[PDB]
Design a protein around this ligand. Structure first.
Ligand code: NDP
Ligand code: NDP
Ligand code: FOM
Ligand code: FOM
Ligand code: MN
Ligand code: MN
Lengths: 378, 378
């Protein structure tokens, strides 16, 4: 029962943690493929040497040369890797909507898709769902892993509300005026998780939670009006489900993505010692507070995009990818990220149509990016 | 389609909450039987009138004559009622180990036993388990109801520990010194629940949590070494399960026994609108702290009685009923309640043998009561 696992984005925060889970559990797991972008050759070389896996994709040409003996190069290498490798699980830990084709290819192989790359589901919408069999997509994202666990506690019609926790990011409690003076350095410091740059910045702008609300609707089929967000600064409660009787079931643990990574990999069997459990022999406090939707409208914007449906969620995500890179590049101030997203959505009525093919998602994304790019430069 | 329900201990705290739950849900439940002691005839009268049930047991013979039209009176009336009534569920909401015979009778009818009367399971031990079919006993006690829901989150070999919450009672965090000057009136004030006198006193002394540890062992078959206790002042988290991967699943709601009552009657289907849900629109916090076993040894003493096994858990509870009545009557100080329990337990080596019949359990309890009564006199 040793599962062959393909790991996309092997060099990143999620990817390296997954490799560790796999290294610890050689009886449950075997890595049979790695994909990365090329920006961390050292990490990737170490990974090839350690796992002995030579079946590798690198996206960047110049870097793939520098490493030597890499089978797949270019923008399509991760997708090709997935298409050309027999596997039982594909862990998609890529960042960005560029994970979309690897996601679809992974589902087409019939393997389990252990999905960290939330943007590809957000972008793909129904296109991704229609490509998947029940149970084929298993969430790595911690809120959704928590939700899937909590949902074992009732029948689907017994669900009243899904409740996602948000750490609130480094700027929890700040005012709108305060946000004007945010720096990339300040935004790059998350209170509870160590992550790659994108999720870090998104958790600070709250665009991450917005993505996760959309991701929740897609995976679990609960309407947006029944998906709530509460701020919980400790990130110990990863999410929860309120049932129609007044009962709430919650999943909790010290923040550590190795737990939901482990569960996604071997779903539905749990993996012993994946992560530390809460220590109930020492005092602690789990705090809740509402989100300041006035100062952080990203989640509301995401519900708006999600309710409109179709390619609109792809537009929401693509606008953020442009506006967020712009902030990181010093081209806009921090508040302009969600400002631009709002601008782009409110002019995107033509995209509230369900996509027929990938190309429709790519069209909406290109439109969204061009629109955000103009707002940036102007 | 309606479930026929016998309610033992109908006039008390759990009993009246259950009647209200049943009245609010006539398409699901009907009362077909009531048992009480005879101390509250106005309530009993009111319940007869409101439910339309004359199938009633009253323990006190003179009381039965006063209220009139009672078919079963005497100390065996509750048992005979259960033996002579067709039902789907017997809700045992009696208090004390006197609930033992009705409990054993309920199991023998084949009905589901919705159990609030934890003493009868603690006292009966393996005698009660021998009489039950798998899944026949369904917990009303809130921690065990919580545990049952939380256990849906895994397969049996995936459980690492069950964690019971305790409010800590009115004397949470008090020193041994502070406890010496405790009065009945002060012990009568619970921080989070409103209850009958016995469960009120036991939650102040932490004997209640002790009983619930034993209750946990018996209901779920988890070893004592994997049943932990944590103090949680809000009583919002009702208990939790930690799994081998580090994940904890918890069940939460504002304190209200109507929730576990409703779930026990309708198991496994949830009852819409049974109780209020946690509201996360207003700020709040959930705290956890350890219990100081130097000041409150009741839990460790229970775990010790449980491991010794047999009639020892009967001894533990019987010694408590005796010492607790003494405290309520002003014959001993508050610390001597658990003090006397520990002493009776240390003298009780002869009872670490499993009961063959109910009479063995009865014998152990007489001894334990006499032994405690001796301690009170000095
Ligand atoms: N704790 C976390 O980190 C969490 C992450 N997630 C989600 O998981 C996903 C991964 O996030 P995270 O690990 O933080 O991101 P990182 O930036 O740490 O990792 C990105 C990975 O993708 C590779 N990559 C980047 N661009 C490309 C490309 N064009 N083609 C192929 N590979 C590429 C990178 O390789 P290289 O840098 O070597 O070029 C790296 O291996 C994201 O979608 C994120 O939102 C969700 C919840 C928590
Ligand atoms: N929230 C709560 O109250 C909780 C309660 N429990 C448990 O549920 C059980 C009931 O508790 P609670 O409702 O507080 O108890 P109460 O003292 O409020 O009620 C006791 C009930 O039993 C009846 N009774 C007493 N003696 C006898 C007898 N000899 N024969 C027949 N009936 C008798 C009483 O009738 P009468 O009117 O004559 O006195 C009354 O209806 C206990 O085991 C308790 O530990 C557990 C968790 C929470
Ligand atoms: O699953 C975990 N994460 O998404 C990390 C970020 C948590 P946040 O968005 O609540 O700050
Ligand atoms: O299930 C509810 N109870 O047992 C009420 C007592 C709670 P406590 O023993 O933790 O104070
Ligand atoms: Mn997440
Ligand atoms: Mn209880």
């Amino acid at each position: 029962g040793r599962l062959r696992v393909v790991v996309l984005g092997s060099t990143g925060s999620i990817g390296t943690q997954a490799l560790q889970v796999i290294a610890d559990n050689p009886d449950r797991f075997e890595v049979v493929g790695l994909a990365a972008g090329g920006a961390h050759l050292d990490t990737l070389l170490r990974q090839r040497a350690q796992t002995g896996v030579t079946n590798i994709a690198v996206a960047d040409e110049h870097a793939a040369q520098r490493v030597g003996d890499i089978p797949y190069h270019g923008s399509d290498a991760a997708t090709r890797l997935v298409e050309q490798t027999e596997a039982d699980v594909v862990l998609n830990a890529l960042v960005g909507a560029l994970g979309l084709r690897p996601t679809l290819a992974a589902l087409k192989t019939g393997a389990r898709l252990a999905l960290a790359n939330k943007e590809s589901l957000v972008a793909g919408g129904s296109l991704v769902l229609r490509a998947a069999r029940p149970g084929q997509i298993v969430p790595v994202d911690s809120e959704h892993s928590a939700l899937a666990q909590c949902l074992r506690g009732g029948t689907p019609d017994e669900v009243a509300k899904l409740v996602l926790t948000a750490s609130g990011g480094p700027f929890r409690g700040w005012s709108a005026a305060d946000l004007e003076h945010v720096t990339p350095e300040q935004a790059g410091a998350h209170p509870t998780f160590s992550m790659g740059p994108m999720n870090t910045l998104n958790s600070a702008s709250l665009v991450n939670k917005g993505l996760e609300v959309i991701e929740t609707h897609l995976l679990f089929g609960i309407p947006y009006d029944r998906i709530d967000v509460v701020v919980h600064p400790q990130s110990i409660i990863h999410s929860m489900v309120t049932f129609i009787d007044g009962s709430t079931i919650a999943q909790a643990s010290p923040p550590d993505m190795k737990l939901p990574i482990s569960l996604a990999l071997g779903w539905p069997r749990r993996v012993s010692g994946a992560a530390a459990a809460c220590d109930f022999h020492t005092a602690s406090s789990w705090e809740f507070e509402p989100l300041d939707t006035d100062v952080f409208p990203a989640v509301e914007l995401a519900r708006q995009a999600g309710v409109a449906g179709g390619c609109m969620t792809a537009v929401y995500n693509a606008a953020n990818e442009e506006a967020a890179a712009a902030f990181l590049a010093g081209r806009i101030g921090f508040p302009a990220i969600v400002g631009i997203i709002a601008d782009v959505l409110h002019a995107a009525d033509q995209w509230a149509v369900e996509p027929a093919t990938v190309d429709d998602v790519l069209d909406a994304q290109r439109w969204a990016r061009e629109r955000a790019q103009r707002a940036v430069s102007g």
